[PDB]
């Protein structure tokens, strides 16, 4: 959709996080609006990140190491040293590509557990970080897993102290595990000013 902030319309694709920066992605255009930032800002991706494609399928960082990882087609970037590995045209296939994966929707990491999982339309998969092997299949729910949230989920992020922001469509709902709950029902055009 548009970015079209005066219009409840708008959808995403992904969204990562950053130290304390949250940066939206939008087909070929990123959003930026965090920290000090009154107003957001479309700008081309490729205008900035070099080697690095456009139409990102699921951004999820890892504060660990500080990292990042672009997801696109059946290729993955690696971020270093905020510079994607040069000549990488690495593919999932190289140990993940189950049935027939290649475009992602949303992905995760959870650092109260050590495990990242992706969602596949309607599907909820879940790579061991640990132990380094991805669960067999593993065809689970997500609105099922996680009630509130839904059984599409666009953007994921975890951007918080202990919370999940989690969006699809033009909403923008937060789960606390707290008590697997959900006190935030605002949308993307929410913070912008409409
Ligand atoms: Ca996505």
Same mark, same amino acid.
């Given at each position: 959709? +548009?970015?079209?902030?005066?219009? *409840?319309?708008?959808?995403?694709?992904?969204?990562?996080?950053?130290?304390?920066?949250?940066?939206?992605?939008?087909?070929?255009?990123?959003?930026?609006?965090?920290?000090? !930032?009154?107003?957001?800002?479309?700008?081309?991706?490729?205008?900035? #990140? *070099?080697?690095?494609?456009? &139409?990102?399928?699921?951004?999820?960082?890892?504060?660990?190491?500080?990292?990042?990882?672009?997801?696109?087609?059946?290729?993955? #970037?690696?971020?270093?040293?905020?510079? *994607? +590995? %040069?000549?990488?045209?690495?593919?999932?296939?190289?140990?993940?590509? %189950?049935?027939?994966?290649?475009?992602?929707?949303?992905?995760?990491?959870?650092? !109260?557990?050590?495990?990242?999982?992706?969602?596949?339309?309607? $599907?909820?998969? !879940?790579?061991? +970080? !640990?132990?380094?092997?991805?669960?067999? &299949?593993? %065809?689970?729910?997500?609105?099922?897993?996680? $009630?509130?949230?839904? %059984?599409?989920?666009?953007?994921?992020?975890?951007?918080?102290?202990?919370?999940?922001?989690?969006? $699809? &469509?033009?909403?923008?709902?937060?789960?606390?595990?707290?008590? $697997?709950?959900?006190?935030?029902?605002?949308?993307?055009?929410?913070?912008? &000013?409409?």
């Amino acid at each position: 959709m +548009e970015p079209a902030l005066c219009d *409840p319309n708008l959808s995403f694709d992904a969204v990562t996080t950053v130290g304390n920066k949250i940066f939206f992605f939008k087909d070929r255009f990123f959003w930026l609006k965090v920290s000090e !930032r009154p107003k957001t800002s479309v700008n081309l991706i490729s205008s900035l #990140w *070099p080697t690095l494609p456009s &139409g990102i399928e699921a951004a999820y960082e890892i504060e660990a190491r500080n990292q990042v990882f672009l997801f696109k087609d059946d290729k993955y #970037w690696l971020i270093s040293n905020l510079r *994607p +590995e %040069p000549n990488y045209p690495k593919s999932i296939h190289s140990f993940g590509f %189950p049935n027939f994966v290649k475009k992602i929707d949303a992905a995760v990491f959870n650092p !109260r557990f050590y495990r990242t999982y992706f969602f596949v339309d309607n $599907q909820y998969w !879940r790579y061991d +970080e !640990r132990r380094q092997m991805m669960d067999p &299949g593993y %065809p689970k729910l997500i609105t099922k897993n996680f $009630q509130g949230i839904g %059984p599409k989920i666009d953007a994921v992020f975890y951007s918080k102290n202990k919370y999940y922001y989690f969006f $699809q &469509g033009s909403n923008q709902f937060e789960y606390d595990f707290l008590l $697997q709950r959900i006190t935030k029902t605002l949308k993307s055009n929410s913070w912008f &000013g409409c």
